[PDB]
Design a protein around this nucleic acid. Sequence first.
RNA 1: AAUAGAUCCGUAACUUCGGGAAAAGGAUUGGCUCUGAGGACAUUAAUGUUAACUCAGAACUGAAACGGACAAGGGGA
RNA 2: CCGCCCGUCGCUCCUACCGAUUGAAAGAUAUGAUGAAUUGUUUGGACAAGAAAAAUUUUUUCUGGAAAAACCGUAAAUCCUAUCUUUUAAAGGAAGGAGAAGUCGUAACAAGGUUUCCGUAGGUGAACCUGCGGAAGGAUCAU
RNA 3: AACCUGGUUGAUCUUGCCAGUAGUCAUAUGCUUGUCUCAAAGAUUAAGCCAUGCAAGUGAAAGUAUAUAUAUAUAUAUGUAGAAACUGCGAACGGCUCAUUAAAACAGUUAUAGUCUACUUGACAUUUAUAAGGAUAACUACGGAAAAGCUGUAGCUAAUACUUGCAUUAUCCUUUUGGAUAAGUAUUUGUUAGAAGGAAUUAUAACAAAGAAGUAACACGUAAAGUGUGUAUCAAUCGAGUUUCUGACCUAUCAGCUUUUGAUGUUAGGGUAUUGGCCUAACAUGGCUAUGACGGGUAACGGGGAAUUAGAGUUCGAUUCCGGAGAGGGAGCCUGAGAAAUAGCUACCACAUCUAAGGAAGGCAGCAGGCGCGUAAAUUACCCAAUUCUAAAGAAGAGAGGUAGUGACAAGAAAUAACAAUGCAAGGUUUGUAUUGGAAUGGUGGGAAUUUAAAACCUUCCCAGAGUAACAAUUGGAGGGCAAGUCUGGUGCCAGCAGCCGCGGUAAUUCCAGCUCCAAUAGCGUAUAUUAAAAUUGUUGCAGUUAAAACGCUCGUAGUUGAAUUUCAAAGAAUCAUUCUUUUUAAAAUCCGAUUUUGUUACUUUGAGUAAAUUAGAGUGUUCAAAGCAAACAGUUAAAGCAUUGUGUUUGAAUACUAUAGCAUGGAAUAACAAAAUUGAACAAGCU
Lengths: 171, 185, 257
Amino acid sequence: RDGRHKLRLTGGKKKIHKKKRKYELGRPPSNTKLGSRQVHVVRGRGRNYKYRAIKLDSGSFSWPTFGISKNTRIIDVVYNASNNELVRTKTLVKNCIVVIDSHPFTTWYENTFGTTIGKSKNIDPLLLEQFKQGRVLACISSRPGQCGKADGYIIEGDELLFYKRKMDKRN
Amino acid sequence: PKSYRNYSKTARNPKRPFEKERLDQELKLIGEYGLKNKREIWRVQYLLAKIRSAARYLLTLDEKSSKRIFQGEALLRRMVRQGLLGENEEKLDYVLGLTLPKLLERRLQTKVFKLGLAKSVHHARVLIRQRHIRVGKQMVDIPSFLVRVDSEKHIDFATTSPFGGARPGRVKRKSLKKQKEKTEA
Amino acid sequence: GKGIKKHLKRVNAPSHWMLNKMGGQYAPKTSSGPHKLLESIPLVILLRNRLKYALTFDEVKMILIQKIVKVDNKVRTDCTFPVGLMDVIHITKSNEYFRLLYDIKGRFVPHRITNEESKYKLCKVKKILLRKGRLSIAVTHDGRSIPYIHPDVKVNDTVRLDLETGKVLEHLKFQVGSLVMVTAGHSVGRVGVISSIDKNMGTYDIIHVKDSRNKVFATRLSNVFVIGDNTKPYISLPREKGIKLDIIEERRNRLKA
RNA sequence: AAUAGAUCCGUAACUUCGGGAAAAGGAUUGGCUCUGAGGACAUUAAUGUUAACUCAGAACUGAAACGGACAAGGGGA
RNA sequence: CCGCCCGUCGCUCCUACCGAUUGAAAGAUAUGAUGAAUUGUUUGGACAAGAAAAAUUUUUUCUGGAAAAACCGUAAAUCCUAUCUUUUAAAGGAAGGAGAAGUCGUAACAAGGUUUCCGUAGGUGAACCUGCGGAAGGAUCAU
RNA sequence: AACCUGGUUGAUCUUGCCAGUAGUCAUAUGCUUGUCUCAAAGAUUAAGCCAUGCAAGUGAAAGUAUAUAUAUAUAUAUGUAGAAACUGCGAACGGCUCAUUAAAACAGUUAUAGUCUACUUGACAUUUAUAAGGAUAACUACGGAAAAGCUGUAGCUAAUACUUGCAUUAUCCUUUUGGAUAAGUAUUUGUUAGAAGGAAUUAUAACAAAGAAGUAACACGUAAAGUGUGUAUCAAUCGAGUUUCUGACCUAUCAGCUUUUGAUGUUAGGGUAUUGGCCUAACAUGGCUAUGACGGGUAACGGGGAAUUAGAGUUCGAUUCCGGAGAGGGAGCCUGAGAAAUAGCUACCACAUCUAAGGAAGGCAGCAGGCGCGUAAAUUACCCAAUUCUAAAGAAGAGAGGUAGUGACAAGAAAUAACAAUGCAAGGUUUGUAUUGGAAUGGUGGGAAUUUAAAACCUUCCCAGAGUAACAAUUGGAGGGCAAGUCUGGUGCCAGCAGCCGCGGUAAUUCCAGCUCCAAUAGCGUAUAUUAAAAUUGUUGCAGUUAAAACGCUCGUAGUUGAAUUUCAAAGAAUCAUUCUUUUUAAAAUCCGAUUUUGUUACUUUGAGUAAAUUAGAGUGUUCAAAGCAAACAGUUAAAGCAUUGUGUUUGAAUACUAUAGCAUGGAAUAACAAAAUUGAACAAGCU
């Protein structure tokens, strides 16, 4: 399924022998929707098991400015850099932008610092309203079709600013 | 599958099949060395060409070249061991001068004829075929046997040959004579 | 399918195994183990074609069944077991010990070894790794992993590994005066003192080795084995003492007898 | 009687090189929910107000049907 | 030189070419149509096991789950169309080669009886003839 | 052995080809064939079709035994075995074939810092317990179907089949010792610190989240405690997948290809074991090409290699080994560490088997064998004894492999006599030669030793066993080339021969025969192909006024080729009369008068890696040789060596080649490129 059957560098076509070998493989994609957690197991080469996630609803998400990861439930996937039918059909891929329940992070901030390691950082203002609404923006960072879970990190700073402009001189 | 046993030719056909002078000298050689067929002297020329090519290649090299002081000495010692060269030889140029009679001198039939035993070269050939001769502790019935300088000292009749001390003579004639003597007596 | 090949054609066998063309169509493929197939010899060959104790593979198996042959003081019963460059094989029945070595020609020869030397094997370190807990471990040419090496032991060094305890006793460096032995080169089996080394950025590193008779020969860094310091070898070399003689004087001193 | 609109593809002999040619011959077409592209206008490199229907693509949907009626070449030697 | 020799036309045989016949056949690609089998996902949903009660039976739930179906995908195979490749039939046409003492002429080799030859164009039974411009490989190395 | 000869003419010298000549591990075929050794063999065409039989199985301490049998002290405790079956491992190796395949495969050379890896080897582990659970084979009995490696229902039972599940260690303080603190292997995400590599986002470590799989509810016994089986991670090993650079035959009557349908690249993702347009989405318009792209052809698997070779070259390589591919043609898939497997499955196409007609079953390009195709290729043999593989690993299997059979494929050795006397011929009492007449010896028959898994063969020994040694050698020729008859009959331009020139019409040196002779010889012809010949493909190394061949002419791009010039030189030791070796002599940085580097490449020199077989080549009397890689030495049975009484000793299996490309390396010559002025420097001082 890989490496042949296509034009050369010059543009000529190559006569084919050596029919498809198993190690070329190429399994079908895992269009991971969000929903009740369900993951199948695929036996890759050498009996190495891979976890093909079909639906997830939660995952470990990190506060990178504070560098602390908390498990939380994802709400809705709102952007992905690739084809934008994936956001419409609500699939989870490696670096799509999703919405995350902010309550675990706010509660952790309260129990650690108080007031509504590398402490006393002064955070940023633009994330405060996003927290106060209750839902925050995050970027996936794992590969759900490979590791079987959808982990990610809260986006802030100019990256958040970039995605905010890209989502909503705007429509 | 295919056996790994090497094998190769030993003679090269002459080309120009009907050269009068070459044919005449070949007949000279085979008649006077008592050998059987035109293949034999062709094998001898094939061998001699092998040593000649080796010597020519060696002489192309310069002196004090390790290839030379290895291959040339190996060839020289091999030649003096087979007896084609005397002690007066020291160089490869003398190797280059080897000739067909000088190579045919070392045939077993030639050597036994020279040493005696057989009063003809064809008699020597037939005796060798009838396995009456020994090169010392071992009996060979191959007339094309090439002797070395350490072998001619001990060429003699095979111990199992009638001329070597075995069964004396025709058992049929001896039995007839003894039966006639017994009947008469 | 296209799995691992499990046969070895006789003509395809390594040259130093030194098998005859007509002696069957196959050669004993060494079982995977502590040494590479090319850089070792199966003990079937070791005690059939070298020690001549057994003249058939079945007699090799009969020998091996009795736990009488030990490779590094531990019993081995695999017919096609790789014995490798230098190690002590002890036969208990005849009570003899062989340390395997190369010769100047480049074949594998057992060397008779006394008891005190038979517990004292050399191991050239190939890799220095560190695992959890900042514990360092050495991977040797013997396919052996030794944890807790001295920090001063370097990547190309050679340690004296005691056979019973499996512990290192002392290590030898690779300076320009260190006695070395070439293991796979054009000059395999030669012994010298390493005249110099030169580091090639991103390519093979070459070292030039000085012989006893001031003969310089170069080789790749990957196939040398430190066997002592400038003072003396830490093992007993075979009768040629690792001195490769030229094609001329070899014939000259073979002739005189 | 047979299609016949439009879009995409493909198009021979022959030839006065202009054509032949809509050659021949294929595929698609509804509805709905969306996505993308194509402009104009002012303020201190960035933010707002606002219009045209025109193309392209994707889901879903139905008794596989969609130039649904009307309109509308039969081709070839 | 009673030498040599050219071509047309007759006859025989062989080779090859053009050829109407929307010629034929066998393959190979490409598109389109149909499309078995099947990975994956989903829908199922024969049941097989659990959990409650009355002192043989009932509900509900939980997984595990066979047929069957749908959808992307891998995609054999068949058919249509187009193109290409190879082979091959053919009325007729027109060459070449070989054969024999055939017919007609005399083109060339001598100044070959009109010097020969080239390119081009026209004509003629054939070799060939003629015009224009060249060459000497000429029959002239030269008032 | 770096070679030529016949043929155009009345005769000559050329060009030029035809013919001759020799080889072929190169095929077929004709004639003939007494020995031994060695041994290719259905590739060519039909990767065409196949009857039949075999070709992968496996239990010697070590998973599971009331099928059953046996043995010890007395129904007891031990055992020994054990059909079947479950479980485990293997069947992905091997063997065959060469259809596909033209920068593909392959070869040399790299990378994997982009990955997977069973067996085996070394390290070594983390969040009821006097030992946990059901469920199944074999089997029992009732059955079905013509048939098959078909299987239905009910009842039990095991397991190393399947599944649950039981301490401790480390760290900080007074400072041996007492207190105090902490606890997930891979893998994934986020934030940081950071022994080696050439370069790390490396090893590793810290913090925050997840988190597999495990760490023995298992079986036999070693020092006068072990093993087997299983298991997390790392490492090794047996490998594999991708990957860098360079290298291929003919064709331009194939010049522009690729790009909707991925073509080239970017970004993000998916997928994979991993990288990658491998795939998806968006975007850009790229990518290759006369240095031959894209096509077409190949009677093309590539290489190691083979034939021919003076040196160049030319041709071949299906075929011992390596790599690739395939199992009638395609595609798809399960198990598994490893397969897109085919003596595994699923489907379609083409074939094709049994059938009770309902349905089943197939894949010899494995070994034999058959049909067909053909010019073209062997036994339906024996054995696991050797080599080696698989297993629960002495002990079983193996058409792998070995042995024999057929075998004028090739290759090596080598019979078909030798000898003495007269007679004859030659010669100054020497050679050759129709008679005698005794020796020698195989071929052959028989017995044996031996060999062999058994047998056969070889070798050796013993009986018989050669005079027309009937134990009889043939093939092709006799005009020239080209060795050998103008000998004899027949035919008479017929028959025929003849590679070419030619012969044949009454004297045929050439046809048909006899005799003789010649050549090769157990071999000799013929056909086709190929190499040399062929300096008739010409780089070495052709020819072009008239023999074939200078474009009608000039310009012109690619290509090919390109003036001179930059450091010259001087002085000293050693053979023979010379030749050969050493030192310094500008400038800039390094060392307190001294310590030391001074473009790039081609090219050239040295090395490293150089699989074997083959080749060259060292050694080695296989009786020689082809061979093979062995072997050699004292020893009517013991001296010597060494060991503090016994233990054989000495060895050899070398060396070279392994592109042209790649790695390192000395370099002065020859070649290029670089730097070099309508300017470009260096130094010193002050300033920032």
